[PDB]
Amino acid sequence: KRVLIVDDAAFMRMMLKDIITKAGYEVAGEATNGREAVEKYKELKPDIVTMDITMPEMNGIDAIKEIMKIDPNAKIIVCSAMGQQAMVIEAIKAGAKDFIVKPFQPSRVVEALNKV
């Protein structure tokens, strides 16, 4: 299953890519902010996206909304430090399928990939 990893932190993108590949998924690409995420989603058409919230230019909520427009069946797991109730509600409302708060343990990423 091909995954696009979206996060502005080079280290996070690095560790997620490592977990995803070792769990048997294929890393399709990476994006570093919300605009790029929509750009890459169009280009790559991944099966699954992992989505940070706090990013320069355009945040994760708006990128979710943008990808859902491109593809109503997009499968997006949020992976963010912004684990407040109101942010989880907003991300799920926008169309994400799952939400993992940072710091997280790697098994929760795996089950989220499976779930979608």
């Binding site: 684990g83 407040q84 989880v88 929760r108």
Partner: peptide
């Protein structure tokens, strides 16, 4: 005001 992952798993189920 950040929730736990169990808190979130819970909240997600509620939302479905």
């Amino acid at each position: 005001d950040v929730l736990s992952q169990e808190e979130i798993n819970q909240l997600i189920e509620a939302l479905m």
